[PDB]
Amino acid sequence: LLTLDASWVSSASWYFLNVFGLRSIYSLILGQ
Amino acid sequence: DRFKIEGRAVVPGVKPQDWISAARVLVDGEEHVGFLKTDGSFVVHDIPSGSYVVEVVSPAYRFDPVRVDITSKGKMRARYVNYIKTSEVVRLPYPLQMKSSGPPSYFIKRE
Amino acid sequence: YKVTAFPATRNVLRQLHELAPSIFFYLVDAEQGRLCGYRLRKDLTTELSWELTIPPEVQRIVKVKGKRSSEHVHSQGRVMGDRSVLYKSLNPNLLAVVTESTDAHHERTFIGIFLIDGVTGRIIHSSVQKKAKGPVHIVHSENWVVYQYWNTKARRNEFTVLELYEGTEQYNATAFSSLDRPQLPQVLQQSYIFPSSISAMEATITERGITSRHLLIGLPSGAILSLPKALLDPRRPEIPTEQSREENLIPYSPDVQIHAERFINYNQTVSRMRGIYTAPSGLESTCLVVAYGLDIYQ
Amino acid sequence: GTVGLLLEHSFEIDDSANFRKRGSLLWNQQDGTLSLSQRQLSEEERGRLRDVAALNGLYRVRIPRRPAGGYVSSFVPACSLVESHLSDQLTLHVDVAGNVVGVSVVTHPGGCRGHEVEDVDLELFNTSVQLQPPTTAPGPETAAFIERLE
Amino acid sequence: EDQVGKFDWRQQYVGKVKFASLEFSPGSKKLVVATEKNVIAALNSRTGEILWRHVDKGTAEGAVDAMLLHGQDVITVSNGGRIMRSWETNIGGLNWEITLDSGSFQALGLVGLQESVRYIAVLKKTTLALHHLSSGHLKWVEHLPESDSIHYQMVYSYGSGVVWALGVVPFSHVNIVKFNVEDGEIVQQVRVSTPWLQHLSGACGVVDEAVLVCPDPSSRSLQTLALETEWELRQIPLQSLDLEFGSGFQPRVLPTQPNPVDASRAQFFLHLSPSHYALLQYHYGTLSLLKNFPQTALVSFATTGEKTVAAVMACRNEACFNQTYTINLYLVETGRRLLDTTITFSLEQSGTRPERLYIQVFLKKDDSVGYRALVQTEDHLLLFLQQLAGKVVLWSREESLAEVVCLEMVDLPLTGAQAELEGEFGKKADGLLGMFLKRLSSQLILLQA
Ligand SMILES: *[C@@H]1O[C@H](CO)[C@@H](O[C@@H]2O[C@H](CO)[C@@H](O)[C@H](O)[C@H]2NC(C)=O)[C@H](O)[C@H]1NC(C)=O
Ligand SMILES: *[C@@H]1O[C@H](CO)[C@@H](O[C@@H]2O[C@H](CO)[C@@H](O)[C@H](O)[C@H]2NC(C)=O)[C@H](O)[C@H]1NC(C)=O
Ligand SMILES: *[C@@H]1O[C@H](CO)[C@@H](O)[C@H](O)[C@H]1NC(C)=O
Ligand SMILES: *[C@@H]1O[C@H](CO)[C@@H](O)[C@H](O)[C@H]1NC(C)=O
């Protein structure tokens, strides 16, 4: 679809968002 | 005034009694309708003069349509169907020998 | 010409007394070739607003296809390369009247398209396909009109697409009033060849109108072809250009090929088709299709 | 040579039909040209038009079907006609055989905004006139495709 | 993606039945039907599915005019009497197709000789033709005398070796023309005066040995004429039989010729008034009322070889009480109802009545005669009734759906779970604390569930 909004993302974008958002969460469960 | 289109459809390897009970013969897209006999042949009646496109319609087997030209004096000729270049002729036999190219590809494979 | 309301409760009576001058009826008399249009007054009476006449001596009306009142248009414009937008002329009260010539000679018969506005009566478009014959199957939708006919000079079935594109700047992005639209839309037409006859035709409809629009074309052999409307585009250029590549447009090819892989019914042929119904289906990617002729298929 | 078609206008507060003679369209069937000859709006007609613009009424234009035998009509909001200094556009849609099919009235600029106008801006009609036959539709272009095949 | 059958479904239909042929082996489960949609199909007897189907043109050029059955072959005449075809019922294909001469179509019938059916007889307003049976080649064709004024409407023939073409003039004389089969020469011609007679197709009928019989209610009698050994219409009254015609109604004579090569049946049916029939017998000039069926809707015939029987239909307690219809079998040679041969059924709709009735009979294992009845109602519904008790309706087929004119898709009602969402949201509680407890109680009901 070329008409669907750009806000709707595929799975790779979700994975990369999680990769970039869990870096700071790793410091809570771990010692750092 | 009006003439008839004769032909003999045939499927390679399959017997007629296995596919004639579901096929038709359409001239100019249901403008004239005919049905097949037991030996695979077919005849369409009350065809006035002009240029028509005969196609043997069957859900389980595909056939190539053939352009039939019938002059006002009864002379019938056959050729290939080409909507582009409506003047090109490729002489096909007559009575029509419309052999099938096998079952049609209704589906697309996965992946 | 007196209007009866149902349900005729007091609340509906009030909601009509407050909304009367916005309701317009149009009647098309095919035997006389008349097209009258009446305005609803406050006391449920109609006053003649507009009137056109297509003389039956030369043209007879066969189809009057208004656009569905349940469909939605997602994008009010189309990117035309260079990050530029070309806006659509989505007239919500447009009719695409189709007429056929009374002269049925193979050298003088013709088809006629009349894009009219239902409220005012201003004929937005008047076109005549010369040396063409019926029956005429027409699909009218958000912005385009796709009608099929039978070219008698070349003896072949032909599609014709009309797209109603506005300028590069929309007249009014707040509302659409057929009384205050002075600009004439830009009608782009293009004709294609079709290698088979047609028994029915419809277009897929969905709730938001996001997915691609397809044309379900019921052939006389029972098989229901699914032709992408994106293929029936008036902008497909006869010679490629850089903008055609940038917009991902295919050069103009007149042969609209029929491939068996496109039949939405593999071998469940519908003999002697008579109609195709499409429902939005709750999702945004599926359309519920019901083809009814002799056989019923869903 | 030329043929004369009547042209009548109607504007009333009760939105009724009171078509009175406005002018005549001269139509050259041998050439395809269309001209107009009218009578300017009087003081009473201008007053009625201003009152109709106040009441948001309509302005109906009508011509005979044949130069009696029938009427072909259309309408435009009188507000746009008054606020546009009587700048209107008539279009006469005909058939291939030359029969009068439709009349279309347009006001430039379209849309009402309640702009106040003096009487001196309502005593000179500014009417463009057009004749519209049906445009021949295009067919499939095969020659270019045949060359492109090479 | 070759995931068929999961989303799509197709229902095949044939139009309103016009000519049905149930006479068969009948060991084979076949039911050939020609419909009002220019469609010829072979329905299955045991399930009701379409074995094969052939769809002609939907316009008037495809209208099936007549349909006969010989053995496993079905002869069809269509296109205003212009095209004739012979379908083979087993394979579902064609045996031969021919084009008949122009002219209106009036009657079609088989002819034969020497205890064998060999030719087909076609009747047109200008000529009578005889074609072959296994090849379709025209054997001969002969003009009809006085065709400009005499409307020829009947064709009768048996093993005698001659064909009778019967024509009438409205409120005037009738005329019989007897041709020879093997030569086509007009052997005989007869004219009789008839001031009362108005029709020959739906009014008159031939009996055992070329015996033309039909009523005249103007004199309230039956006119008879033995085309073999008579030339005068003997008038027999019905006052002795206590029968009376329906005022302002067109009575009808219904004979039965099981074998198109041998003689007809002396017994026949007489439709005097709507919902009233009478089974009579003709014997050498005199009639004998075998049975009188009052308040009887429909009747049909069958032969199963030599045990020729008839079937009648009537309401149970009544215009019908609860659409409860009972079908019974009688013998033609004597109006004795066959015991243990009653089929009772009911139509689900209110203002629906049966319209057609065809009977397929067979010989039961215990030397008795069993039968299945194909009944077509007003709303184009077809029913195949068997002699059983718990399954009196073998298979039903709603053919009214072959002419869908409108279609709309409505959403199914809300689930029991989605019904609660209207409760907690939209109640418009007075304060925030009230709406809080309301939504909490809704979620509490949900967690309890
Ligand atoms: C587009 O059309 C609408 C209405 O047709 C215009 O919005 C205003 O609507 C109110 C009535 O509710 C009225 O004041 C006028 O009809 C409109 N105001 C003016 C100044 O015209 C709107 O102006 C139009 N143009 C745009 C850009 O939205
Ligand atoms: C119509 O198409 C469907 C799907 O191809 C056929 O149904 C299948 O037939 C083949 C038998 O060779 C098998 O795959 C299965 O028995 C059927 N189901 C599926 C999912 O494959 C059907 O036979 C075709 N009907 C015809 C050719 O008349
Ligand atoms: C007169 O009509 C033309 C056509 O639209 C318009 O451009 C012009 O502004 C009008 N001038 C006056 C004074 O009305
Ligand atoms: C009518 O017939 C149906 C089925 O036999 C039955 O369910 C129904 O109760 C009957 N009603 C009456 C009044 O007989």
Facing D135 at nearest CB: one of C126, C179, C239: C126
Strands (E), E25-150: 31-35, 39-43, 50-55, 64-70, 73-78, 83-88, 94-99, 105-112, 117-124, 127-132, 138-143
Which residue in C93, C96, C97 sits closest to C30, CA to CA? C97
Pocket of ligand 4 (CB under 6 A): E 322, 346
**Closest ligand 3 atom, CA of D85?**
14
Pocket of ligand 3 (CB under 6 A): D 85, 87, 108, 126, 128
| CA gyration radius, chain A | 14
Q: How far is the CA of D123 from the centre of ligand 1 (A)?
A: 28
CB D119 within 8 A of CB D46: yes
- What approach was used to elucidate this structure? cryo-EM
Distance (Å) from the alpha carbon of B104 to chain E's nearest alpha carbon: 13
C174 lines ligand 1 (CB under 6 A): yes
Which residue in E105, E110, E93 sits closest to E40, CA to CA? E93
CB C124 within 8 A of CB C117: yes
Distance between CA atoms of E137 and B70, rounded to whole angstroms? 25
Distance from first CA to last CA of chain D, Å, rounded?
Answer: 52
Q: Residues 124 to 143 of D: which have CB under 8 A from any B CB?
A: 142
Resolution in A: 3.4
DSSP annotation of D46: H
Q: Do A4 and C210 touch (CB under 8 A)?
A: yes
The DSSP bridge pattern shows strands C123-130 and D135-136 to be parallel
**Mutation choice for ligand 2 from C263, C265, C266, C295, CB with most ligand atoms inside 8 A:** C266
Distance between CA atoms of D144 and C154, rounded to whole angstroms? 17
Q: How far is the CA of E306 from the centre of ligand 4 (A)?
A: 38
The chain C residue lying nearest E3, using CA atoms, is C266
Q: Do B33 and E95 touch (CB under 8 A)?
A: no
Residue of minimum CA distance from atom 2 in ligand 3: D87
E8 lines ligand 2 (CB under 6 A): no
CB B56 within 8 A of CB B96: no
B76 lines ligand 2 (CB under 6 A): no
Q: Do E56 and B21 touch (CB under 8 A)?
A: no
Which one-letter amino acid corresponds to residue C46?
Answer: T
CB C194 within 8 A of CB C256: yes
C172 lines ligand 1 (CB under 6 A): yes
Q: DSSP secondary structure string, C50-111?
A: EEEE--TTTEEEEEEEEPPSS---S-SEEE-STT-EEEB---TTEEEEEEEES---TTT-EE
Distance between CA atoms of E146 and E125, rounded to whole angstroms? 10
Distance between CA atoms of E448 and E435, rounded to whole angstroms? 20
Distance between CA atoms of C293 and C269, rounded to whole angstroms? 10
Which residue in D75, D107, D81, D91 sits closest to C48, CA to CA? D75
**Peptide linkage before C55 cis (omega within 30 of 0):** no
DSSP annotation of C199: S
Distance between CA atoms of E400 and B54, rounded to whole angstroms? 33
Bridge partners (DSSP) of residue B44 are B5
Residues 6+ apart with CB under 8 A from E203: E197, E214, E215, E250, E251, E252, E253
Distance between CA atoms of D52 and D9, rounded to whole angstroms? 13
Distance (Å) from the alpha carbon of C266 to chain D's nearest alpha carbon: 30
B60 lines ligand 2 (CB under 6 A): yes
Compute CA B25 distance to the chain's CA centroid, rounded to the nearest angstrom: 6
Residue of minimum CA distance from atom 25 in ligand 1: C172
**Mutation choice for ligand 4 from E325, E345, E346, CB with most ligand atoms inside 8 A:** E346
Structure tokens at E75: 């002869």
Residue of minimum CA distance from atom 4 in ligand 1: C175
CB crowding E111-145: b at 16 or more within 10 Å, else e: bbbeeebbbbbbbbbebbbbbebeebeebbebebe
Structure tokens at B40: 């695979």
The DSSP bridge pattern shows strands D20-28 and D2-10 to be antiparallel
Ligand located closest to E345 CA: 4
The DSSP bridge pattern shows strands B41-48 and B50-57 to be unpaired
Q: How far is the CA of C267 from the centre of ligand 2 (A)?
A: 9
Compute CA E349 distance to the chain's CA centroid, rounded to the nearest angstrom: 22
